[PDB]
C-alpha cells in the first residue's frame, strides 16, 4: 500500500541528494504539462515523491527512515 522513498526517487535506502534530485526530475520532467492537463490526481505523487526529502534530505530523517524505525533490525547488539 505505502511505497518507499529511498525508492521514490530511486534513493538507495541511504542515497543523496543526486538521485533525489534525479528520480523526481525523471518521472516529473515526464508528468509536467503532458498529462497533467487531463489529470490531477497524479499530481500528489509529484509532492508524495518530494515530500521523501523530509525524510531522506535530514541526518535523523535519512539515517531513522532508512530501517524505518529500529523495528526493522531490532536489537543490534
Do not use: C, W
Amino acid at each position: 500500500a505505502k511505497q518507499d522513498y529511498y525508492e521514490i526517487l530511486g534513493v538507495s535506502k541511504t542515497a543523496e541528494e543526486r538521485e533525489i534530485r534525479k528520480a523526481y526530475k525523471r518521472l516529473a520532467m515526464k508528468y509536467h504539462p503532458d498529462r497533467n492537463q487531463g489529470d490531477k490526481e497524479a499530481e500528489a505523487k509529484f509532492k508524495e515523491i518530494k515530500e521523501a526529502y523530509e525524510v531522506l534530505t535530514d541526518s535523523q530523517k535519512r539515517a531513522a527512515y532508512d530501517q524505518y524505525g529500529h523495528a526493522a533490525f531490532e536489537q543490534g547488539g
